Design a protein around this ligand. Sequence first.
Ligand SMILES: Cc1ccc(/C=N/O)cc1C(=O)N[C@H](C)c1cccc2ccccc12
Ligand SMILES: [Cl-]
Ligand SMILES: [Cl-]
Ligand SMILES: [Cl-]
Ligand SMILES: [Cl-]
Ligand SMILES: [Zn+2]
Ligand SMILES: [Zn+2]
Ligand SMILES: [Zn+2]
Ligand SMILES: [Zn+2]
Length: 308
Amino acid sequence: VFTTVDNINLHTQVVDMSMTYGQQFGPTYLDGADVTKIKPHNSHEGKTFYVLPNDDTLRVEAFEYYHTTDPSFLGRYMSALNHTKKWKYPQVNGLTSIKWADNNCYLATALLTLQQIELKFNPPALQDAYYRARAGEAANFCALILAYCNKTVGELGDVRETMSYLFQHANLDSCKRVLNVVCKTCGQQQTTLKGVEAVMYMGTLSYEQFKKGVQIPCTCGKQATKYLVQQESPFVMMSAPPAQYELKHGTFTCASEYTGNYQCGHYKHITSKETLYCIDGALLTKSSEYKGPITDVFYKENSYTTTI
Ligand SMILES: Cc1ccc(/C=N/O)cc1C(=O)N[C@H](C)c1cccc2ccccc12
Ligand SMILES: [Cl-]
Ligand SMILES: [Cl-]
Ligand SMILES: [Cl-]
Ligand SMILES: [Cl-]
Ligand SMILES: [Zn+2]
Ligand SMILES: [Zn+2]
Ligand SMILES: [Zn+2]
Ligand SMILES: [Zn+2]
């Protein structure tokens, strides 16, 4: 056979057929299916098995492909893959979605979002898989998202939490956010955020409203105003607890709709194209206007400076 950790560097092994894989290699998977305690069948000649890293060469190759040394990662990935490879990944409005299964509504929403914003993932394994997802084969990429986010298939998922974890694995170093804070008493303080903190705000959906200002607590004890001075990023994510919100054609890129109770509710995806499209897994509706419960909105950006 061939053992690997990255499916790029293949290492030639000949096995014994009287001994389990797990005896000879440690935990060994096949296409997501744990074959640790199984022995070699005949239709196992020259196939390729993932192995837990058990020597320095494999640890270094694993870090260089996944950007983690966590010894649980591989098995969490292979356990998610074993489901994600059985999901359906329909093309809907020229985007790869996911057919509803195992509480994946939040992954479908994340996947659709990721195909409409500009993002470079640092770990090769994520970048390679993102590319393959864009081109319709997204099983691998969904398993990796589950593994990187410390989520198992069936677990209830927040889209903002998932985007936050993915952004922390993306190149957002360039990204810069300058805010000014205005209290009557303490006065005026400016702060510079970089990376993930530069593209995410929790507390309003409206990029407009962030530019005009929003009321926040001051440590003095008064109410103060936070407004956006300077934004340097290819997008921004604007998030709030779900509430009725109107979405106008052409004024945003895409949004997360969330219906029902904390945790056990369901997401759908709103995207602005030539009209508004609602993507609910395999299902597609369209309308010229939209009002409904929204918790995330994504906007395009490059360079913004305020006129205040
Ligand atoms: C679906 C989900 C999964 C996990 C979690 C939190 N884990 O720590 C949260 C949610 C959630 O209900 N998120 C939505 C979008 C949400 C986020 C924030 C506040 C909310 C208040 C009422 C109802 C939903 C609310
Ligand atoms: Cl890293
Ligand atoms: Cl399954
Ligand atoms: Cl679901
Ligand atoms: Cl990373
Ligand atoms: Zn990294
Ligand atoms: Zn399943
Ligand atoms: Zn103050
Ligand atoms: Zn769901």
